[PDB]
């Protein structure tokens, strides 16, 4: 199940990064709305996004 694999991948990330990716990508919050939602700065959300995609890319590639 594709969503099953997705959740297993997401479970590889820190909670905060999972939350950010779900909010930005699946739900569709902007970076600003996401930062407001999770009590961060937009800058912090951008950094977390970068760190998340890199960890994901690592897993997918390997």
Swiss-Prot record:
A GO term for molecular function:
DNA binding
- Quaternary structure per UniProt? Interacts transiently with the RNA polymerase catalytic core formed by RpoA, RpoB, RpoC and RpoZ (2 alpha, 1 beta, 1 beta' and 1 omega subunit) to form the RNA polymerase holoenzyme that can initiate transcription.
State if Transcription regulation is listed as a keyword.
yes
Q: What is this protein called?
A: ECF RNA polymerase sigma factor SigD
Entire-sequence positions represented here: 146 to 207 of 212
Q: Does the keyword Membrane apply?
A: no
Q: Which domain of life is it from?
A: Bacteria
Give the source lineage, highest ranks first: Bacteria, Bacillati, Actinomycetota, Actinomycetes, Mycobacteriales
Task: Using the UniProt annotation, give all residue ranges assigned to the region (Sigma-70 factor domain-4).
Answer: 7-56
Please quote what the entry notes about the protein's domains: The sigma-70 factor domain-2 mediates sequence-specific interaction with the -10 element in promoter DNA, and plays an important role in melting the double-stranded DNA and the formation of the transcription bubble. The sigma-70 factor domain-2 mediates interaction with the RNA polymerase subunits RpoB and RpoC.
- Give GO terms for biological process: DNA-templated transcription initiation; response to stress
DNA-binding region positions on the chain: 31-50
Any extra detail in the entry? Extracytoplasmic function sigma factors (ECF) are held in an inactive form by an anti-sigma factor until released by regulated intramembrane proteolysis (RIP). RIP occurs when an extracytoplasmic signal triggers a concerted proteolytic cascade to transmit information and elicit cellular responses. The membrane-spanning anti-sigma factor is first cut extracytoplasmically (site-1 protease, S1P), then within the membrane itself (site-2 protease, S2P), while cytoplasmic proteases finish degrading the regulatory protein, liberating SigD.
Q: What does this protein do?
A: Sigma factors are initiation factors that promote the attachment of RNA polymerase to specific initiation sites and are then released. Extracytoplasmic function (ECF) sigma factors are held in an inactive form by an anti-sigma factor until released by regulated intramembrane proteolysis.
Which key words tag this protein in UniProt?
A: DNA-binding, Sigma factor, Transcription, Transcription regulation, Virulence
Query: What is the similarity comment for this entry?
Result: Belongs to the sigma-70 factor family. ECF subfamily.
Give the source species.
Answer: Mycobacterium tuberculosis (strain CDC 1551 / Oshkosh)
């Amino acid at each position: 199940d594709s969503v099953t694999r997705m959740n297993e991948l997401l479970e590889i990330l820190p909670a905060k990064q999972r939350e950010i990716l779900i909010l930005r990508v699946v739900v569709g919050l902007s970076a600003e709305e996401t930062a407001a939602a999770v009590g961060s700065t937009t800058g912090a959300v951008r950094v977390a996004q970068h760190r998340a995609l890199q960890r994901l890319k690592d897993e997918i590639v390997a």
